[PDB]
Design a binder for these strands. Structure first.
Ligand code: AKN
Ligand code: AKN
Ligand code: MG
Ligand code: MG
Ligand code: MG
Ligand code: MG
Ligand code: MG
Ligand code: MG
Ligand code: MG
Ligand code: MG
Ligand code: MG
Ligand code: MG
Ligand code: MG
Ligand code: MG
Ligand code: MG
Ligand code: MG
Ligand code: MG
Ligand code: MG
Ligand code: MG
Ligand code: MG
Ligand code: MG
Ligand code: MG
Ligand code: MG
Ligand code: MG
Ligand code: MG
Ligand code: MG
Ligand code: MG
Ligand code: MG
Ligand code: MG
Ligand code: MG
Ligand code: MG
Ligand code: MG
Ligand code: MG
Ligand code: MG
Ligand code: MG
Ligand code: MG
Ligand code: MG
Ligand code: MG
Ligand code: MG
Ligand code: MG
Ligand code: MG
Ligand code: MG
Ligand code: MG
Ligand code: MG
Ligand code: MG
Ligand code: MG
Ligand code: MG
Ligand code: MG
Ligand code: MG
Ligand code: MG
Ligand code: MG
Ligand code: MG
Ligand code: MG
Ligand code: MG
Ligand code: MG
Ligand code: MG
Ligand code: MG
Ligand code: MG
Ligand code: MG
Ligand code: MG
Ligand code: MG
Ligand code: MG
Ligand code: MG
Ligand code: MG
Ligand code: MG
Ligand code: MG
Ligand code: MG
Ligand code: MG
Ligand code: MG
Ligand code: MG
Ligand code: MG
Ligand code: MG
Ligand code: MG
Ligand code: MG
Ligand code: MG
Ligand code: MG
Ligand code: MG
Ligand code: MG
Ligand code: MG
Ligand code: MG
Ligand code: MG
Ligand code: MG
Ligand code: MG
Ligand code: MG
Ligand code: MG
Ligand code: MG
Ligand code: MG
Ligand code: MG
Ligand code: MG
Ligand code: MG
Ligand code: MG
Ligand code: MG
Ligand code: MG
Ligand code: MG
Ligand code: MG
Ligand code: MG
Ligand code: MG
Ligand code: MG
Ligand code: MG
Ligand code: MG
Ligand code: MG
Ligand code: MG
Ligand code: MG
Ligand code: MG
Ligand code: MG
Ligand code: MG
Ligand code: MG
Ligand code: MG
Ligand code: MG
Ligand code: MG
Ligand code: MG
Ligand code: MG
Ligand code: MG
Ligand code: MG
Ligand code: MG
Ligand code: MG
Ligand code: MG
Ligand code: MG
Ligand code: MG
Ligand code: MG
Ligand code: MG
Ligand code: MG
Ligand code: MG
Ligand code: MG
Ligand code: MG
Ligand code: MG
Ligand code: MG
Ligand code: MG
Ligand code: MG
Ligand code: MG
Ligand code: MG
Ligand code: MG
Ligand code: MG
Ligand code: MG
Ligand code: MG
Ligand code: MG
Ligand code: MG
Ligand code: MG
Ligand code: MG
Ligand code: MG
Ligand code: MG
Ligand code: MG
Ligand code: MG
Ligand code: MG
Ligand code: MG
Ligand code: MG
Ligand code: MG
Ligand code: MG
Ligand code: MG
Ligand code: MG
Ligand code: MG
Ligand code: MG
Ligand code: MG
Ligand code: MG
Ligand code: MG
Ligand code: MG
Ligand code: MG
Ligand code: MG
Ligand code: MG
Ligand code: MG
Ligand code: MG
Ligand code: MG
Ligand code: MG
Ligand code: MG
Ligand code: MG
Ligand code: MG
Ligand code: MG
Ligand code: MG
Ligand code: MG
Ligand code: MG
Ligand code: MG
Ligand code: MG
Ligand code: MG
Ligand code: MG
Ligand code: MG
Ligand code: MG
Ligand code: MG
Ligand code: MG
Ligand code: MG
Ligand code: MG
Ligand code: MG
Ligand code: MG
Ligand code: MG
Ligand code: MG
Ligand code: MG
Ligand code: MG
Ligand code: MG
Ligand code: MG
Ligand code: MG
Ligand code: MG
Ligand code: MG
Ligand code: MG
Ligand code: MG
Ligand code: MG
Ligand code: MG
Ligand code: MG
Ligand code: MG
Ligand code: MG
Ligand code: MG
Ligand code: MG
Ligand code: MG
Ligand code: MG
Ligand code: MG
Ligand code: MG
Ligand code: MG
Ligand code: MG
Ligand code: MG
Ligand code: MG
Ligand code: MG
Ligand code: MG
Ligand code: MG
Ligand code: MG
Ligand code: MG
Ligand code: MG
Ligand code: MG
Ligand code: MG
Ligand code: MG
Ligand code: MG
Ligand code: MG
Ligand code: MG
Ligand code: MG
Ligand code: MG
Ligand code: MG
Ligand code: MG
Ligand code: MG
Ligand code: MG
Ligand code: MG
Ligand code: MG
Ligand code: MG
Ligand code: MG
Ligand code: MG
Ligand code: MG
Ligand code: MG
Ligand code: MG
Ligand code: MG
Ligand code: MG
Ligand code: MG
Ligand code: MG
Ligand code: MG
Ligand code: MG
Ligand code: MG
Ligand code: MG
Lengths: 275, 48
RNA sequence: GAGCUAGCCCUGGCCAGGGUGAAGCUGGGGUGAGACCCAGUGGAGGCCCGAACCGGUGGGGGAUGCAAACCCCUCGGAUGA
RNA sequence: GAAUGCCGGCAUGAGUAACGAUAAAGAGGGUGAGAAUCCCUCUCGCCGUAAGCCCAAGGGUUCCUACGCAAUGGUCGUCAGCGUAGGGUUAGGCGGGACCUAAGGUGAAGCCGAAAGGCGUAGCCGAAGGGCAGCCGGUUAAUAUUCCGGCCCUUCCCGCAGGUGCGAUGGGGGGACGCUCUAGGCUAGGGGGACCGGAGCCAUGGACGAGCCCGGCCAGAAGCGCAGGGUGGGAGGUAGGCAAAUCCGCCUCCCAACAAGCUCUGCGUGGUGGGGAAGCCCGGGUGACAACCCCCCGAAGCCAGGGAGCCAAGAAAAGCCUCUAAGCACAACCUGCGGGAACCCGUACCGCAAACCGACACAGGUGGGCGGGUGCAAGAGCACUCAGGCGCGCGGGAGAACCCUCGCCAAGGAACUCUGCAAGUUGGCCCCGUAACUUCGGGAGAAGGGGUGCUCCCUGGGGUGAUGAGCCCCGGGGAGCCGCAGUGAACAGGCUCUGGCGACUGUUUACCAAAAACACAGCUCUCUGCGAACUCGUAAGAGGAGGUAUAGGGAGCGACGCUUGCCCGGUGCCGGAAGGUCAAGGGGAGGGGUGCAAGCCCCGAACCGAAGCCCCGGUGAACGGCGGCCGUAACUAUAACGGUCCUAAGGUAGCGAAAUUCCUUGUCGGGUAAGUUCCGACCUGCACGAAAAGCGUAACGACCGGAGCGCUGUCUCGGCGAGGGACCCGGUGAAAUUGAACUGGCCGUGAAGAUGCGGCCUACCCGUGGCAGGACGAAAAGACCCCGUGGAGCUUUACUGCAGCC
RNA sequence: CGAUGUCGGCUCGUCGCAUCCUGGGGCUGAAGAAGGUCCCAAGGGUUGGGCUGUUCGCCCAUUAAAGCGGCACGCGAGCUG
RNA sequence: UGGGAGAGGGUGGUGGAAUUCCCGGAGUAGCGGUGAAAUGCGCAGAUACCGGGAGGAACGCCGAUGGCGAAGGCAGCCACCUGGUCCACCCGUGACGCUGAGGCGCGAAAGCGUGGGGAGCAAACCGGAUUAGAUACCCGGGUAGUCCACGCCCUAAACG
RNA sequence: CCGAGGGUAGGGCCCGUGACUGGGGCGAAGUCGUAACAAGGUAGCUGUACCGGAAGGUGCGGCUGGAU
């Protein structure tokens, strides 16, 4: 339930912060964090390979569990729901009856103090984790492995959720958050429910500074550059694109499809994305 | 105003020093060309 | 060759004083319960005034200079991108 | 003899500019061949959030002392950061190493690349971050937490005693964290004393005083006291912490919870050791048996790993603790005590500067800490001032024009000018009061106005203490005093109306542009199913991201409000298993060379044959485009209306003489005495128009217009004054420039602008201060223009390749 | 073209006369007053504002009049910009 | 107190028919549309037919001249939550009533803000016909919107 | 001290006037179409939205004040 501010500064007019209504614990689990090596967009050559990155807050990457088949049958308690600055979801702290402690990505509605579990015979309840083949058709689900035992790859951002459309041999048919219709293997695990903090998208960064705190540096239009810098560079005064709009490296950027044509995954995609 | 020589013993050694030269192939050619000319110092003098 | 300059990384440091007084909390009123209003408390902000510090707006001087970009008067920011 | 030739030497400009902040000098006495310049004394001025003090970096003997003055020193020099010589830097505790990790670097394994090399897990390196044991005083010409003295502490080795399952590079805890705000109690620091100690003082009209002037401390182990921090205890289970585990984690159970207890810090006290002024006397000696106490102010520092709130969610590893494993328990480890042991490097000096970076003893640049007192509301602001440090390494005169900085001005008050450029005005605090409009925050310090000092009296609340005194902090009321004036000095907004652009705070062309430009939250389009797209890379490998479509890339637009119309013919993109074209390859009708021949060899059509192109659709917040002529109303005029040609379609809303209007100072209205600007209008819009967004918009602006008030030396129109120069004298002494020069005016002539030719006129020889008309004055082999089959950046449906992609 | 700085303003002028004013004249469709037109005449004078970069021009208020030109569209080793 | 009817309201869930799209199969030369046609769709295999899948919306028969609500309005089915109302008995309280300026709340459709959703329908808009014209009536497309959550709007031939 | 009023500064209400601009009323015989009254030749009216030279058109809902 996103939170407004009164207009006591120009930026405060439109700014909205998260409500944090579902957060119980307010500091990470010292056993499950590590240092986040901020890169600022540079690669191992030292070269910016991703523009306009750097300078955001310091962060501690909480280790998240994406292979919940690690602990088949060992129930855990939902001990806390905490803020992860490295993603858009919240994370939940699990105290397994094993005594093991793990972070998972917090589905919507998950109740601190409830217990969760994982396995072929798990209950079809928010927070549990089963191979895809054992989840009812028509169930909303998240944290879906793309291949088996390779880790949760799909639907992990706030409010995302794949819905199960049906089965077809060793493969179930998922409707990804993009609207794509894909065949995923039935042995791929997945956490039933939708990822929480759906109000995430309704946030208004308010001002330029807030974007900086996220490590996002200012983004200069190609239209503002010179011909040496950009296809859209130059021009006396203003200027339309003057050619099909294009990236800094030449390739067109309106409509031009870029998925590799002969990709082997093509055999398992039923419908290219909607809308 | 601030000028361009801001001396620094550590920089001056990790940059132009002997060991820096011997790591590169280009650097060994430096010392080779400087021995050939007979330079008294093959390398900047820095006190450390 | 990044000891100048540009960006990012890691680790440290700095920002006199004064002003305004958001949310919240409390109390009071209010109503079926509310919204809400009032007072107090509170002390938010690329908020205000202003040194350090960072600037370089206007004008005068300087022009074989104090100086291969300086000096004086004025002026922008100064918890933040 | 010329190349703006090259190297050198010496001229000219010239005894000319200048001699580096306008903080400032004077005299006496010394030294010496020589003194404005060195030494000493007295007077004067300057800095004092420094122009004082302490670190760091960098510098590298510049430190101290003696002897020197050729050169360096912008003058002088007896002086010196200069020359010669001798001295000077002392550590188990300060810093760095024999400790730890950060980015990054490097790199057994492994990967990759013609070579050189590029990657890379561990590991190693890597500090101004983590960890770690010393405080005060004395001493030298020069070092001091280093030597010395007092009082403390750490680690290693061996031994004694006591205790215990001891044992780790492995397991666990901890280390260990942001920003803002902030409590209690302290300390640093400071103010006052009529209390304590002190050489003295009585001036010049008064004062022998509760007079003046100086000082009234510092460290410190155990113990103790005050303030804080950290911390539950027991038991049973146990499948997790990549072996084990009594530890940790998870579960249950009993007891204990603002506590207490144990533990750790800070402060205070504390054996004890130090220090100790003014003044006088020659750094010292005295003062002195110095005294060393009371009250107040009080941190941003300490207790600290304190508390609260917030969102953007805040290093690692070692030291340390605990768990066990091999092993070993004659061991080993813990504690206490004792003896011994404890290495390498730095330490001088400069350090906002004459010793560092700027070629200079250069008005520039340089990170951290301390930075006293009084007053002004506060403060690191401002004026004076302590400690301390300086008067800036040419001076003396004169009192011109002129220049810089500065002060004042009759009457007028923007009439100046491109422009109020500049300089006035305003200025702090308290109180009263404050409009349109608005996004209800604002606009707002709107505007405008009153007050401000000193004396006496009366009284209200707070902190300390004790509830009182004293100290200290906020106030209230009454009566008076003086001047031109009470933020009496210093620091400290001129205001308002109205448009353009841009929402806003931000960013920019280091060094002629700070803006209307870039950025920006926000809107749309599009790509991306994750070994993602995209980026760098030959590759490996990275970034993307330890992210996963509420995510990430690219593009345009740029808060917000109301909106964003019509065209898919062409271009781009998207879709289309048919058709057409299409290379290598398949096929091999059918020829050809050669051979006695089997054969060997060559050419080769039909037909099959991908992408791409053709072709069919789609698509505008994709590239883009959004007509012409003629006619028509019962005055005229103008056309709601029509006719026709063409297009893919003919510009909708809103706006408009505009940051766009050529004609144009359009026309009309407002403002003014007067208005090529401005504002409001109209609309034949040369040549607006809807995300290269359209029309608005409160607030914001060192943006660009226009206007009014205030006030002025901007101006009528100038005058006077101050200082620093210019001028004169002593000292030192440049520069560009320069064919040579014995270098006048006019009218002509001349390659067309003559000191230099002709004619005439004028003119004794040489300077100094001044002015800039000429020497087509200097400077720069014109930066505009052309030319060169000269170069380079950029573009594209110019050509031809190439990467990449299909 | 191995450089002759280019508009306008300001400051400083100086010359020409095809005379704007002032002085002397002739003719007039010159009654007077006041004009027209031409001749002589360069001694002196030839204002202050609004607008615009402007020169120029229009306008306000005056005036004896508000003259026109040349001097590298006079004058940037004089200033402005 | 004991009983009854009901599409009264809110939530959660769910069933079938139909249309559209998509995949498979079978199949060929037209389908569609109208007053008549054209646009459009279809040999790149449409329409008609069968199986499968996705999704949204509205609920045929019952259904009535019906029932409920203060009005606007409410219709598959199931459960929960909940308003009103009527009958019976004659038990309780004893005028506790009626109306109602302001206040407040509800208020069809369209419309607006932020998300979602989107099958059919359909302003705007395109095209085909008609026509003197046809910015219409008719035909083929078609975007808001129609649906959901939240919050506005407060109008009506809101009528008996 | 108060004090008529004078002055300075800023507000609120009303009146008059204003380039231009919006519709409105009225005025024998101007132009364009034919929306309504007959089922008015698409039943009409309606609230709302969008569109159009103009009456109006269309969408969604509502009324009969709709004929047969
Ligand atoms: N509008 C009503 C006319 C009335 O007569 C009046 O006095 N009208 C005007 C009243 C305005 N408040 C004044 O405007 C100006 O002065 C104010 C101070 N008084 C400023 O606050 C204001 O920021 C400024 O803008 C303006 O001065 C007055 O103008 C008058 O005085 C002028 C010179 O004296 C004259 O030129 C005017 N014609 C005459 O109107
Ligand atoms: N069949 C064709 C219609 C024709 O053209 C016609 O009648 N045309 C009408 C012509 C009349 N003369 C006009 O009336 C006005 O104009 C006159 C001037 N001539 C006046 O004197 C008269 O005093 C006045 O009255 C009137 O305005 C015209 O009517 C049109 O305009 C009127 C205003 O909207 C409407 O009410 C009519 N429905 C509409 O037809
Ligand atoms: Mg708020
Ligand atoms: Mg939350
Ligand atoms: Mg929370
Ligand atoms: Mg750890
Ligand atoms: Mg690397
Ligand atoms: Mg298989
Ligand atoms: Mg972005
Ligand atoms: Mg963006
Ligand atoms: Mg941008
Ligand atoms: Mg540009
Ligand atoms: Mg480049
Ligand atoms: Mg390009
Ligand atoms: Mg371009
Ligand atoms: Mg451009
Ligand atoms: Mg242009
Ligand atoms: Mg791909
Ligand atoms: Mg600078
Ligand atoms: Mg240099
Ligand atoms: Mg530096
Ligand atoms: Mg190597
Ligand atoms: Mg070298
Ligand atoms: Mg750098
Ligand atoms: Mg440096
Ligand atoms: Mg920091
Ligand atoms: Mg400081
Ligand atoms: Mg403060
Ligand atoms: Mg205030
Ligand atoms: Mg308060
Ligand atoms: Mg504050
Ligand atoms: Mg601020
Ligand atoms: Mg200052
Ligand atoms: Mg300046
Ligand atoms: Mg600067
Ligand atoms: Mg500048
Ligand atoms: Mg100058
Ligand atoms: Mg400020
Ligand atoms: Mg920051
Ligand atoms: Mg010769
Ligand atoms: Mg030369
Ligand atoms: Mg001389
Ligand atoms: Mg001379
Ligand atoms: Mg000097
Ligand atoms: Mg000089
Ligand atoms: Mg001087
Ligand atoms: Mg001086
Ligand atoms: Mg002598
Ligand atoms: Mg001197
Ligand atoms: Mg440095
Ligand atoms: Mg040196
Ligand atoms: Mg020394
Ligand atoms: Mg000498
Ligand atoms: Mg000498
Ligand atoms: Mg000599
Ligand atoms: Mg000398
Ligand atoms: Mg050793
Ligand atoms: Mg190490
Ligand atoms: Mg390497
Ligand atoms: Mg260290
Ligand atoms: Mg140490
Ligand atoms: Mg000696
Ligand atoms: Mg000692
Ligand atoms: Mg043990
Ligand atoms: Mg941590
Ligand atoms: Mg924060
Ligand atoms: Mg102390
Ligand atoms: Mg004090
Ligand atoms: Mg006496
Ligand atoms: Mg006495
Ligand atoms: Mg495990
Ligand atoms: Mg284990
Ligand atoms: Mg394992
Ligand atoms: Mg295990
Ligand atoms: Mg085990
Ligand atoms: Mg108990
Ligand atoms: Mg305790
Ligand atoms: Mg102590
Ligand atoms: Mg003695
Ligand atoms: Mg003694
Ligand atoms: Mg004595
Ligand atoms: Mg501080
Ligand atoms: Mg503090
Ligand atoms: Mg902690
Ligand atoms: Mg064992
Ligand atoms: Mg054993
Ligand atoms: Mg034994
Ligand atoms: Mg023990
Ligand atoms: Mg010992
Ligand atoms: Mg050693
Ligand atoms: Mg060494
Ligand atoms: Mg030393
Ligand atoms: Mg020093
Ligand atoms: Mg110093
Ligand atoms: Mg310093
Ligand atoms: Mg010095
Ligand atoms: Mg230097
Ligand atoms: Mg030097
Ligand atoms: Mg000097
Ligand atoms: Mg200096
Ligand atoms: Mg600086
Ligand atoms: Mg201080
Ligand atoms: Mg004080
Ligand atoms: Mg301080
Ligand atoms: Mg002193
Ligand atoms: Mg000194
Ligand atoms: Mg001087
Ligand atoms: Mg002069
Ligand atoms: Mg005056
Ligand atoms: Mg005046
Ligand atoms: Mg002007
Ligand atoms: Mg102006
Ligand atoms: Mg000014
Ligand atoms: Mg004023
Ligand atoms: Mg407000
Ligand atoms: Mg206000
Ligand atoms: Mg304003
Ligand atoms: Mg005021
Ligand atoms: Mg204002
Ligand atoms: Mg006063
Ligand atoms: Mg006073
Ligand atoms: Mg006084
Ligand atoms: Mg007390
Ligand atoms: Mg008096
Ligand atoms: Mg004052
Ligand atoms: Mg101010
Ligand atoms: Mg005004
Ligand atoms: Mg304009
Ligand atoms: Mg701006
Ligand atoms: Mg602001
Ligand atoms: Mg610049
Ligand atoms: Mg530059
Ligand atoms: Mg600016
Ligand atoms: Mg926007
Ligand atoms: Mg590449
Ligand atoms: Mg690769
Ligand atoms: Mg990663
Ligand atoms: Mg733009
Ligand atoms: Mg608005
Ligand atoms: Mg059309
Ligand atoms: Mg196309
Ligand atoms: Mg097409
Ligand atoms: Mg070929
Ligand atoms: Mg072929
Ligand atoms: Mg093909
Ligand atoms: Mg476009
Ligand atoms: Mg458009
Ligand atoms: Mg006519
Ligand atoms: Mg007629
Ligand atoms: Mg067409
Ligand atoms: Mg056009
Ligand atoms: Mg249109
Ligand atoms: Mg116009
Ligand atoms: Mg135009
Ligand atoms: Mg005009
Ligand atoms: Mg005009
Ligand atoms: Mg203008
Ligand atoms: Mg036109
Ligand atoms: Mg016109
Ligand atoms: Mg146009
Ligand atoms: Mg466009
Ligand atoms: Mg508005
Ligand atoms: Mg605006
Ligand atoms: Mg700004
Ligand atoms: Mg500005
Ligand atoms: Mg003057
Ligand atoms: Mg003048
Ligand atoms: Mg003077
Ligand atoms: Mg003189
Ligand atoms: Mg002289
Ligand atoms: Mg002569
Ligand atoms: Mg001639
Ligand atoms: Mg001549
Ligand atoms: Mg001459
Ligand atoms: Mg002279
Ligand atoms: Mg001259
Ligand atoms: Mg020359
Ligand atoms: Mg020249
Ligand atoms: Mg040339
Ligand atoms: Mg040109
Ligand atoms: Mg050629
Ligand atoms: Mg040619
Ligand atoms: Mg060429
Ligand atoms: Mg030339
Ligand atoms: Mg003028
Ligand atoms: Mg003048
Ligand atoms: Mg003359
Ligand atoms: Mg003439
Ligand atoms: Mg004449
Ligand atoms: Mg006659
Ligand atoms: Mg007469
Ligand atoms: Mg005549
Ligand atoms: Mg003459
Ligand atoms: Mg003329
Ligand atoms: Mg003109
Ligand atoms: Mg005219
Ligand atoms: Mg006359
Ligand atoms: Mg000319
Ligand atoms: Mg000229
Ligand atoms: Mg000039
Ligand atoms: Mg000029
Ligand atoms: Mg200028
Ligand atoms: Mg200029
Ligand atoms: Mg200019
Ligand atoms: Mg019952
Ligand atoms: Mg019942
Ligand atoms: Mg076929
Ligand atoms: Mg669904
Ligand atoms: Mg009924
Ligand atoms: Mg009965
Ligand atoms: Mg009965
Ligand atoms: Mg009865
Ligand atoms: Mg009864
Ligand atoms: Mg009764
Ligand atoms: Mg009764
Ligand atoms: Mg409604
Ligand atoms: Mg509706
Ligand atoms: Mg609308
Ligand atoms: Mg939406
Ligand atoms: Mg037609
Ligand atoms: Mg026709
Ligand atoms: Mg037509
Ligand atoms: Mg009809
Ligand atoms: Mg809409
Ligand atoms: Mg009704
Ligand atoms: Mg009815
Ligand atoms: Mg009165
Ligand atoms: Mg009066
Ligand atoms: Mg007034
Ligand atoms: Mg008539
Ligand atoms: Mg009709
Ligand atoms: Mg009709
Ligand atoms: Mg009809
Ligand atoms: Mg009818
Ligand atoms: Mg109707
Ligand atoms: Mg029309
Ligand atoms: Mg039309
Ligand atoms: Mg028409
Ligand atoms: Mg209608
Ligand atoms: Mg129509
Ligand atoms: Mg229509
Ligand atoms: Mg209807």
């Amino acid at each position: 339930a996103v939170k407004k501010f009164k207009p006591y500064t120009p930026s405060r007019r439109f700014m909205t912060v998260a409500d944090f209504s579902e957060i119980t614990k307010t500091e990470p689990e010292k056993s499950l964090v590590k240092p986040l090596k901020k890169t600022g967009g540079r690669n191992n050559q030292g070269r910016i390979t991703v523009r306009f990155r750097g300078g955001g807050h310091k962060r501690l990457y909480r280790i998240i569990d994406f292979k919940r088949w690690d602990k088949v049958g060992i129930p855990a308690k939902v001990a806390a729901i905490e803020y992860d600055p490295n993603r858009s979801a919240r994370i939940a702290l699990l105290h397994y009856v094993d005594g093991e402690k793990r972070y998972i990505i917090a589905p919507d509605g998950l109740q601190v103090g409830q217990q969760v579990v994982a396995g072929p015979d798990a209950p079809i309840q928010v927070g549990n984790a089963l191979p895809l083949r054992f989840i009812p058709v028509g169930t909303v689900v998240h944290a879906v492995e793309l291949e088996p035992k390779k880790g949760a790859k799909l639907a992990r951002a706030a409010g995302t959720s794949a819905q199960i459309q049906g089965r077809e041999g060793d493969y179930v048919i998922l409707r990804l958050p993009s609207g794509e219709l894909r065949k995923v293997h039935g042995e791929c695990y997945a956490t039933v429910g939708a990822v929480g903090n759906a109000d995430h998208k309704n946030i208004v960064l308010g001002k330029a500074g807030r974007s900086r705190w996220l490590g996002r540096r200012p983004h200069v239009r190609g239209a503002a550059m010179n011909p040496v810098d950009h296809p859209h560079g130059g021009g006396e005064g203003r200027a339309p694109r003057g050619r099909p709009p294009a990236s800094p490296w030449g390739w067109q950027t309106k409509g031009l499809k870029t998925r590799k044509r002969r990709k082997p995954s093509s055999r398992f995609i039923i419908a290219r994305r909607k809308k | 105003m601030k000028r361009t020589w801001q001396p620094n013993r550590r920089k001056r050694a990790k940059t132009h020093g002997f060991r820096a030269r011997m790591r590169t192939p280009g650097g060994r050619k430096v010392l080779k060309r400087r021995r050939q000319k007979g330079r008294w110092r093959l390398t900047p003098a820095v006190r450390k």
